[PDB]
């Protein structure tokens, strides 16, 4: 029921030729709305959702300046992190961070997040209170100490209560048809004989939004957790998601098995068997 505005930021210190030194993608819930990057110091921006056509030119001009300033700052931060971690100058290193704000059904603010990683591992996290920080080691402890002495989380809260809230409100209004929706899964069980005489049962779920889903197989009175093969949920490319879960079973016992599907768009767990 709640909704989130989320940005996923990456900076790279020695990118390959043609590769971005900085890139960020923005989402509302599970729908991407833009790409920003900087390649050889040139900032670029592209829309990815149809409601972005309603943004005024002033939106993109302000965004362009933010992209230039962020990329310069992340580059400087990568230089400092190399020194504090006693690392060599030749290699390429990675700085990632996530920024988000969350509202409830009635558009009331519920929370926000700021979290950063260096070379793929947690570095620092802003806590639930939006005032204190959680570090992982003595380098990030220095960062925490400086952020809390400076009171720097004040300025993140002002971003959350200002531009983050403004954009989430406007995007939920202009993109209402795409964003304020739940598409239920269309589900079926497929049957595949195997060369050795047993059978693969594959339970499919297609065409659902949002992405979060659960698929489970169950045998009469026996738990099949370790038995099933479950693929990571995956985009179909049209704005919906798909997934399957499979078990191998003896020929003739297919009706002992049941697939259960749980999704926001269903009124209750759906139960499926191989029909035949």
């Amino acid at each position: 029921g709640s909704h989130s505005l989320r940005y996923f930021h990456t900076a790279v210190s020695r990118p390959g030729r043609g590769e971005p030194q900085y890139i960020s993608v923005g989402y509302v819930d599970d729908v991407q709305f833009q790409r920003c990057d900087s390649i050889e110091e040139i900032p670029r921006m592209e829309p990815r959702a149809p409601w972005m056509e309603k943004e005024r030119p002033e939106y993109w001009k302000e965004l362009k300046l933010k992209v230039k300033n962020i990329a310069q700052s992340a580059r400087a931060n990568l230089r400092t992190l190399l020194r504090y971690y006693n690392q060599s100058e030749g290699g390429s290193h990675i700085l990632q961070w996530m920024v988000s704000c969350e509202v409830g059904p009635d558009m009331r603010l519920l929370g926000a997040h700021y979290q950063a990683a260096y070379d793929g591992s947690d570095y620092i996290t802003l806590n639930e209170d939006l005032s204190s920080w959680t570090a992982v080691d003595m380098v990030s402890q220095i960062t925490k100490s400086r952020l809390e002495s400076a009171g720097t989380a004040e300025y993140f809260r002002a971003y959350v209560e200002g531009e983050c809230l403004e954009l989430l409100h406007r995007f939920l209004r202009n993109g209402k048809e795409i964003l304020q929706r739940a598409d239920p899964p269309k589900a079926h069980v497929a049957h595949h004989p195997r060369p050795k005489g047993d059978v693969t049962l594959r339970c499919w779920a297609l065409g659902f939004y949002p992405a979060d889903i659960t698929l489970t197989w169950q045998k009469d009175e026996e738990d099949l957790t370790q038995d099933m093969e479950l693929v990571e949920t995956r985009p179909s490319g049209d704005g919906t998601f798909q997934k399957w879960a499979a078990v191998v079973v003896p020929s003739g016992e297919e009706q002992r098995y049941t697939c259960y599907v749980h999704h926001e768009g269903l009124t209750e767990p759906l139960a499926l068997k191989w029909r035949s």
Partner: protein, 99 residues
């Protein structure tokens, strides 16, 4: 850290021989973000492959979607080939109409 890509090759819509469709190559769970993805039909590279923007998940690992138009038939073979720095050599995954 360094993390090895997981690869899935699949159609947008359930496949039916002779009917146009979209072939997806979804690559997840890798770090760092540099990656090379190609798609092949009957042993020939497909030049017209669309790439989504790259993003990442809450555990910091990256993910990306490549896709191209295709028409499945009873004889044509399709593959996605992926190379990442965590791998000594590229990995090829073939489309299977049942998965």
């Amino acid at each position: 850290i360094q993390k090895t890509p997981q690869i899935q090759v699949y159609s947008r819509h359930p496949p039916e021989n002779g009917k146009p469709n979209i072939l997806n190559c979804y690559v997840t769970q890798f770090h760092p973000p540099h990656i090379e993805i190609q798609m092949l039909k009957n042993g020939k590279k497909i030049p017209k492959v669309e790439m989504s923007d790259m993003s990442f998940s809450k555990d910091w690992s990256f993910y990306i979607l490549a896709h191209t138009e295709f028409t499945p038939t009873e004889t044509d073979t399709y593959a996605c080939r992926v190379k990442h720095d965590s791998m000594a050599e590229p990995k090829t995954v073939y489309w299977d109409r049942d998965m």
